[PDB]
Specification:
Protein name (chains A, B, C, D, E): Microtubule-associated protein tau
Oligomer: homopentamer
Subcellular location (chains A, B, C, D, E): Cytoplasm, Cytosol; Cell membrane; Cytoplasm, Cytoskeleton; Cell projection, Axon
Largest sheet of chain A: none
Helix content of chain A: under 10%
Largest interface: A-B, 108 and 108 residues
Structural class of chain A: mainly beta
């Protein structure tokens, strides 16, 4: 028999803002010969702006209802190999250099 | 029989702002020959702005209801290999250098 | 039979602001030949701005309801390999250097 | 039968601000040939600004309700390999140097 | 039957500010050939600004309700390998040096 009464009269709301930055993986790479790896970028963000808003309204006297709201994420990883491997690289941004040598003699 | 009464009269709200910075993994890399790895960037942030807003309204006298709200994240990792391995690299940004040598003699 | 009465009259609220900085993993790297690894950056932050807002309203006399709100994160890691390994590297930003030598003679 | 009465009349609130700094892992690295590793940066911060806001309102006389709000984070780590290993490196930012030598003779 | 009455009349609040500094792991590293490791930076800070705000309102005469609010963090670590190991390194920022030698003769 209880009464839940909400009265709103003459409400003036304004200027509700929310801002988020950029999310770039690889961007503005003038260099070369590099190894850049972005592995599993998982995002569950939320940028929300609520102005005079109400949530769910429930009127369940003696209900007994079962409500389940679940979010499951399963992305377990098991690495058995090299992710980023760079070898035998000569990188000379300069000029006029002489006799730049790299060697890799593997006798298995 | 209890009464929950809320009265709002002549409310003036303004200038509700929320800001967040950028989230960049790899950006502005003029260099070369490097190994850059971003592994599993997981984000669950939330930038919210509430202005005169109300949450969920529940009227459940003697309900007995079961409500479950769960969030499960399972991304366990098991690494059995090199993530970032750089070897046998010559990096000469300068100029005029002479006789730059690198050697790797592995006799297995 | 108890009454919960809240009365708000002639409320003037303004200038509610919240700011957060940027979250960059790898950014502005002019150098080369380096190994940069960002491993599992997990974020659960929240930047919120509340202005004259109310939470959940519950009217449950003698309810007995069971409410569960859980957040579970399981990302245990078990490393059995090198994450960042740099070897046999010559890095000469200068100029005019002569006879720069690196050697690695492994006889297994 | 008890009454919880709250009356707010002619309230003027303003200038509610909260600021947080940037959270950068790797940024502004002009050097090269280095090993930089950021391992599991976990963030659970919260920058909030509340202006004339109210929390959850509960009216549960003789309820007996069970409410559980839990947050569990399990990311135990067990390292069995080198995280950052740099060897056999020549780094000469200067100029005019002569006969710079590095050697590693491992006879296993 | 007890009454909890709170009356607020003609309240003028202003200039509520809270500031926090930046939290950077690795930043502004012009040097090279170094090993920089930031291991498990865990943050649970909170920068809050409350201006004329009220907390949760509870009206539970003879309730017997069980409320649990727990936060559990378990990230125990067990290291069985070198975290940062730098060896066989020549670092000469100067110029004009002659006959700089490094040797490592391991006969296992």
């Amino acid at each position: 028999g209880g009464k839940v009464q909400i009265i709103n009269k003459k409400l003036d709301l304004s200027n509700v803002q929310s801002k988020c930055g950029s999310k770039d993986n690889i961007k503005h790479v003038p260099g070369g010969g590099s190894v850049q790896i972005v592995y599993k970028p998982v995002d569950l963000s939320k940028v929300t702006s609520k102005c005079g808003s109400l949530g769910n309204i429930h009127h369940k006297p003696g209900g007994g209802q079962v409500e389940v709201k679940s979010e499951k994420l399963d992305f377990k990883d098991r690495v058995q190999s090299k992710i980023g491997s760079l070898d035998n690289i000569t990188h000379v941004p300069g000029g006029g250099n002489k006799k730049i040598e790299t060697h890799k003699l593997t006798f298995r």
